[PDB]
Amino acid sequence: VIGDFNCTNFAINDLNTTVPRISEYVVDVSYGLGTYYILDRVYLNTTILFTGYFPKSGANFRDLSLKGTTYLSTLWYQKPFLSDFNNGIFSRVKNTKLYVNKTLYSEFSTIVIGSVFINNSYTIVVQPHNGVLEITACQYTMCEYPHTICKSKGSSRNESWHFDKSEPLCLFKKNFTYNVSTDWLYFHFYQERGTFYAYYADSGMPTTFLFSLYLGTLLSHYYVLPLTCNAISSNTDNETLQYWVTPLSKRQYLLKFDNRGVITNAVD
Ligand SMILES: *[C@@H]1O[C@H](CO)[C@@H](O[C@@H]2O[C@H](CO)[C@@H](O[C@@H]3O[C@H](CO[C@H]4O[C@H](CO)[C@@H](O)[C@H](O)[C@@H]4O)[C@@H](O)[C@H](O[C@H]4O[C@H](CO)[C@@H](O)[C@H](O)[C@@H]4O)[C@@H]3O)[C@H](O)[C@H]2NC(C)=O)[C@H](O)[C@H]1NC(C)=O
Ligand SMILES: CC(=O)N[C@H]1[C@H]([C@H](O)[C@H](O)COC(C)=O)O[C@@](O[C@H](CO)[C@@H](O)[C@@H]2O[C@@](O)(C(=O)O)C[C@H](O)[C@H]2NC(C)=O)(C(=O)O)C[C@@H]1O
Ligand SMILES: *[C@@H]1O[C@H](CO)[C@@H](O[C@@H]2O[C@H](CO)[C@@H](O)[C@H](O)[C@H]2NC(C)=O)[C@H](O)[C@H]1NC(C)=O
Ligand SMILES: *[C@@H]1O[C@H](CO)[C@@H](O)[C@H](O)[C@H]1NC(C)=O
Ligand SMILES: *[C@@H]1O[C@H](CO)[C@@H](O)[C@H](O)[C@H]1NC(C)=O
Ligand SMILES: *[C@@H]1O[C@H](CO)[C@@H](O)[C@H](O)[C@H]1NC(C)=O
Ligand SMILES: *[C@@H]1O[C@H](CO)[C@@H](O)[C@H](O)[C@H]1NC(C)=O
Ligand SMILES: *[C@@H]1O[C@H](CO)[C@@H](O)[C@H](O)[C@H]1NC(C)=O
Numbered sequence: 001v002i003g004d005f006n007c008t009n010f011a012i013n014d015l016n017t018t019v020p021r022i023s024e025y026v027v028d029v030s031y032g033l034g035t036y037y038i039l040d041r042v043y044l045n046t047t048i049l050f051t052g053y054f055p056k057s058g059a060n061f062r063d064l065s066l067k068g069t070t071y072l073s074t075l076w077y078q079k080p081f082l083s084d085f086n087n088g089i090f091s092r093v094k095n096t097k098l099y100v101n102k103t104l105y106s107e108f109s110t111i112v113i114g115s116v117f118i119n120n121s122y123t124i125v126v127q128p129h130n131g132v133l134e135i136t137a138c139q140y141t142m143c144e145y146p147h148t149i150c151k152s153k154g155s156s157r158n159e160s161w162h163f164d165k166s167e168p169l170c171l172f173k174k175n176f177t178y179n180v181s182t183d184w185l186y187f188h189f190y191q192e193r194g195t196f197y198a199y200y201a202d203s204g205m206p207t208t209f210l211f212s213l214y215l216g217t218l219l220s221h222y223y224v225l226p227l228t229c230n231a232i233s234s235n236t237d238n239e240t241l242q243y244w245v246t247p248l249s250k251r252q253y254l255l256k257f258d259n260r261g262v263i264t265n266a267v268d
């Protein structure tokens with residue numbers, strides 16, 4: 001289970017439907033993808049050696065996305081999917097592009113980062129809403145079996161990942177836009193000296209600072225929520241979710257900046 005709140009008993013089973021896929025793609029930082037711009041600093045026409053929270057060059061990713069229809073499996077809410085956060089993660093997220101009429105909608109899996117996932121602890125939630133990325137860090141009453149839904153196409157389940165009838169305490173609550181037409185979003189989520197940091201990009205590029213949040217406590221777990229739709233499967237549209245994740249470590253990189261301040265290259 002994720003949290004301990006019984007939000008639902010509708011269509012729960014114990015089926016072993018999948019395990020996390022290992023990517024045939026691997027981390028290649030030679031053009032700065034898998035790096036980040038350092039906070040609000042600009043470096044121009046230079047190389048620096050920088051020690052930061054970076055993926056290993058040549059590492060695989062695990063696809064942690066889960067797509068449901070009516071049923072959820074209890075095995076989706078356990079290891080290997082419920083994951084130790086350690087120092088942090090780099091993720092490569094497929095933006096799943098869906099059409100209702102001719103009109104485009106963007107979907108992808110929510111990620112939650114936390115420890116015990118109960119309302120005496122803060123859970124960081126990063127959720128898309130069709131070109132708006134909502135980010136919060138609140139004392140959420142997380143469900144046992146949390147999930148999100150297609151807003152775009154139908155869902156035979158209602159959205160249910162927390163149960164708070166009046167708003168929980170929040171340390172952070174902000175929205176960020178992203179380009180709905182992109183194929184990929186990238187994130188770094190990491191922690192250092194009791195402070196969480198988030199970075200993103202909506203292109204094959206180094207990630208840009210979203211926010212930082214002091215917690216004092218360690219985040220110990222993360223989980224990518226199942227998303228349920230009457231769509232995004234081989235018998236209906238051949239579209240899919242993918243939420244690829246690879247671990248970060250405290251690691252020295254060479255970073256190469258051009259005269260515009262873009263990271264053009266990096267070395268592990
Ligand atoms: C922060 O997070 C915590 C932990 O998740 C939340 O605390 C839980 O809150 C829920 C909802 O109030 C509690 O569930 C309720 O417990 C009552 C007491 O349980 C005893 O009595 C029942 C018989 O009534 C026995 O079966 C049981 O074994 C216990 O001996 C129940 O009376 C409630 O019943 C209602 O809901 C159920 C399930 O939907 C229905 O079947 C019933 O018909 C009835 O409608 C209910 O189960 C839960 O016990 C709390 N857990 C703890 C550890 O305290 C906090 O609410 C949350 N805080 C905030 C601010 O959101
Ligand atoms: C994490 C995972 O394993 N995810 C896969 C999912 C589950 O294995 C399945 O849900 C069972 O999960 C549990 C917990 O029991 O199967 C999917 O494929 C199905 C066939 O496997 C799909 O064709 C569905 O077939 C139906 O017969 C049915 O209900 O399964 C009718 C339904 O209308 C139709 N869904 C549509 C149209 O989207 C799906 O989607 O659900 C592809 C997902 O990638
Ligand atoms: C951040 O984005 C979310 C999603 O768009 C906003 O939530 C909506 O807020 C309006 C307020 O009138 C509600 O009517 C909607 O029901 C909400 N939508 C969803 C999907 O939750 C939120 O207000 C935005 N701003 C902040 C600061 O969080
Ligand atoms: C969860 O809540 C539902 C709805 O009230 C109830 O029927 C079910 O018995 C509960 N299950 C558990 C494991 O508490
Ligand atoms: C689920 O199925 C896979 C493939 O057969 C297997 O490796 C795994 O051990 C099974 N059990 C669980 C709980 O994942
Ligand atoms: C960038 O740095 C190189 C190497 O020092 C130098 O040749 C070049 O003239 C510099 N260009 C600018 C615009 O500073
Ligand atoms: C979803 O929400 C509606 C409106 O509250 C409710 O009627 C329905 O029973 C809920 N559950 C499902 C599985 O549709
Ligand atoms: C949005 O993404 C598409 C596909 O990658 C790209 O062609 C387009 O130029 C982008 N637009 C903006 C405003 O970023």
Ligand SMILES: *[C@@H]1O[C@H](CO)[C@@H](O)[C@H](O)[C@H]1NC(C)=O
Nearest residue numbers: 232233234235236237238239
């Ligand atoms: C999905 O792709 C397979 C393989 O190309 C094809 O046989 C099937 O007809 C496709 N179905 C849909 C709904 O596109």
